[PDB]
């Protein structure tokens, strides 16, 4: 019964399926949630009904998730342009120093994906000892941040020598063209490459992380968000949404 | 030197000169401060430069200042749609129960103004014992709220039996047409009627109040706003702005 009594929230988004779509082509206002679909758009709609808040979406000008002074979604949150980030925001230690994360919607991890040549690598760190494949990460997105901050200096070297692409879409494009290992996040990258039989994963998933919403420290509505998220997680609702969008593709 | 480090604020406005103009006719976005002039628009511009915040303006759909569940500017502030109200918001006890007021920009009071008939009244409470003049107040604006909440049951009766108009402009219009005493706020109503020789004030100004900005309780930026406001008040800058706009008319 306890709720936010009609508080208005601005929610930070970046389009990336299956979590958040691009705005409809007919959209007349990019902030209008009715212009969007996706797992997280539906989570937010249900959350708003339960927690009794109104909301609009705000997309950062720089279209970055957030790297560190921060940019992207995290800079908009810290600046009070938004009140909560509702992408699948990866919880890593560098971000957690400066913002809070909700109870998570699901667990992710890194995968190294490539267009299969037959002479595929067997483990991601084999990239450091060869010259057949380039590899890449998105600037100001969690995989780069993880790899560069990791205790393991070989992961540091992977980030150091990676091609830096400007967007997730660009990384996928370069990967699809061949000769290029894109290191990014599961499960999302498995959705993004669904049905592309020439795309394979090198070795095992590595460096797991939670995917959650982002909030300023000491937020008065964190506990209510966490309780709502836990309910739909424990009930299987988040898994069912994800599967619905996976099957729509 | 201490400041808000680039925080973004949404500021609540209602057009009413000399404090805030209507948006320019060429305006492409009603939230854009560059579309406005007025005493308080200039105060906010200087405040933003000193306190290092970015901002836009938000006008309530109902175009009400705030009466009590609240409506108008005060409901937008309580709902977190805005972060500070930057009209000349009158500080009264009913509002102060639920929001905070900044250090004030100036002192106001109520005046009862009328189109002179020669047979003008001598004191505002004489309205209660005659039938020549109607009188009126704006709904959900401070004079009604003051008069209705006052310890003096005769002021209560004035509010009770007053015509309720939907806007300040409408009250002025009815007053200008004759036979109608408009009870509203000085000094603003003296600006609004500058040069109208047929308009006179009945008796003395009464029921003074501070005019200030509105903030949620426990705002972390109240002390910085207060310090800035005090500086421009003590220096005479607010008086000089007011005089500049008074002379532009
Ligand atoms: Na980079
Ligand atoms: Na190494
Ligand atoms: Na009324
Ligand atoms: Na009376």
Checking phi first, is residue A181 left (phi over 0); if not, alpha (psi -120 to 50) or beta? Answer: beta
Measured between alpha carbons, how far is residue A135 from residues A118, A124, A141 in Å? 17, 10, 15
How far is it, in rounded angstroms, from Cα B231 to Cα B240?
13
Residue holding tokens 């279209």?
A: A63
Q: Please provide residue B143's backbone torsions phi and psi, each rounded to the nearest 5 degrees.
A: -55, -45
Would you tell me how many other CB atoms lie within 10 Å of the CB of residue A154? 12
Query: Which letter does DSSP use for residue A102 in this model?
Result: P
How far is it, in rounded angstroms, from Cα B81 to Cα B95?
18
Which residues in A59-128 belong to E strands, given as ranges? 84-90, 100-101, 106-115
How far is it, in rounded angstroms, from Cα B35 to Cα B44?
14
How far is it, in rounded angstroms, from Cα B145 to Cα A84?
36
Task: Please give the method by which this entry was determined.
Answer: X-ray
**How are beta strands A84-90 and A7-12 bridged, if at all?**
parallel
Furthest C-alpha separation in chain A = 60
How far is it, in rounded angstroms, from Cα A222 to Cα B93?
32
CATH dotted code for A1-108+209-249: 3.40.190.10
Chain B residues lying within 8 Å of A54, measured CB to CB: 79
How far is it, in rounded angstroms, from Cα A170 to Cα A28?
27
Q: Is A9 close to B80, i.e. CB distance below 8 A?
A: yes
The helix/strand/coil state of A61 is coil
Measured between alpha carbons, how far is residue B172 from residues A150, B26, B140, B185, B190 in Å? 69, 26, 16, 12, 11
Measured between alpha carbons, how far is residue B95 from residues A18, B15, B73, B160, B164 in Å? 46, 20, 11, 20, 20
Burial bucket for residue B118 (CB in 10 Å: 0-12, 13-18, 19+): exposed
Measured between alpha carbons, how far is residue A109 from residues A86, A179, A193, A248 in Å? 18, 23, 16, 23
Tell me the fold of A109-208: D-Maltodextrin-Binding Protein; domain 2 (3.40.190)
How far is it, in rounded angstroms, from Cα B42 to Cα A179?
58
Q: At what angle do helices A153-161 and A142-149 cross, to 10 degrees?
A: 130
The helix/strand/coil state of A159 is helix
A1-108+209-249 matches A109-208 in fold: yes
Residue B185 Cα to ligand 1 midpoint, Å, equals 58
Furthest C-alpha separation in chain B = 60
Exposure string (b/e) for A49-82, b if CB count within 10 Å is 16 or more? eebebebebbbbeeebbbbeebbbbbbbbbbbbb
The helix/strand/coil state of A179 is coil
How far is it, in rounded angstroms, from Cα A21 to Cα A35?
9
Q: What is the DSSP string of chain B?
A: ----TTEEEEEE---BTTTBPPPPTT-S-TT-GGG--SHHHHHHHHHHHHHTEEEEEE--TT---------HHHHHHHTTS-SEEEEEEE--HHHHTTSEEPSPSEEEEEEEEEE--SS--SSGGGGGG-SS-EEEEETTSHHHHHHHH-S-HHHHHHHHHSEEESSHHHHHHHHHTSSEEEEEEETHHHHHTTT-TTEEE-S--EEEEEEEEEE-TT-TTHHHHHHHHHHHHHTTHHHHHHHHHHHH-
How far is it, in rounded angstroms, from Cα B95 to Cα A198?
66
Chain A residues lying within 8 Å of B8, measured CB to CB: 79-81
Contacts of B40 (CB under 8 A, 6+ apart): B19, B20, B86, B87, B88, B105
How far is it, in rounded angstroms, from Cα A139 to Cα A66?
9
Domain locations in chain B as residue ranges = 1-108+209-249, 109-208
Residue B153 Cα to ligand 4 midpoint, Å, equals 5
Of A7, A8, A81, nearest to B8 by CB-CB distance is: A81
Tokens of A204: 């095992």
Q: At what angle do helices B222-234 and B39-51 cross, to 10 degrees?
A: 120
């Amino acid at each position: 019964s306890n709720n936010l009594n009609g508080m208005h929230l601005r929610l930070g988004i970046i389009p990336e399926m299956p979590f958040i779509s691009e705005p409809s082509l007919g959209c007349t206002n990019i902030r209008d949630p009715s212009c969007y679909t996706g797992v997280n758009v539906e989570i937010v709609s249900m959350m708003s009904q339960d927690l009794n808040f109104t909301y609009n979406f705000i997309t950062p000008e720089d279209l970055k998730f957030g790297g560190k002074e921060w940019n992207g979604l995290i800079r908009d949150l810290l600046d009070n342009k938004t009140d909560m980030i509702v992408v699948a925001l990866s919880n890593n230690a560098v971000r957690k120093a400066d913002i809070d994360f909700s109870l998570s919607m699901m667990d992710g991890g890194l995968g190294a994906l490539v267009k299969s040549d037959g002479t595929d690598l067997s483990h991601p760190l084999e990239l450091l000892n060869q010259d057949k494949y380039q590899w890449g990460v998105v600037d100001s997105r969690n995989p780069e941040l993880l790899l560069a901050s990791n205790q393991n200096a070989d992961y540091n070297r992977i980030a150091e020598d990676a091609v830096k692409v400007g967007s997730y879409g660009e990384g996928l494009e370069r990967m699809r063209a061949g000769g290029f290992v894109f290191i990014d996040e599961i499960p999302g990258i498995n959705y993004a490459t669904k049905g592309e039989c020439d795309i394979v994963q090198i070795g095992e998933t590595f460096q797991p992380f939670e995917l959650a919403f982002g909030l300023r420290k000491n937020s008065p509505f964190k506990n209510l968000v966490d309780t709502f998220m836990l309910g739909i997680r424990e009930q299987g609702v988040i898994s069912e949404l994800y599967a619905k969008y996976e099957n729509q593709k």
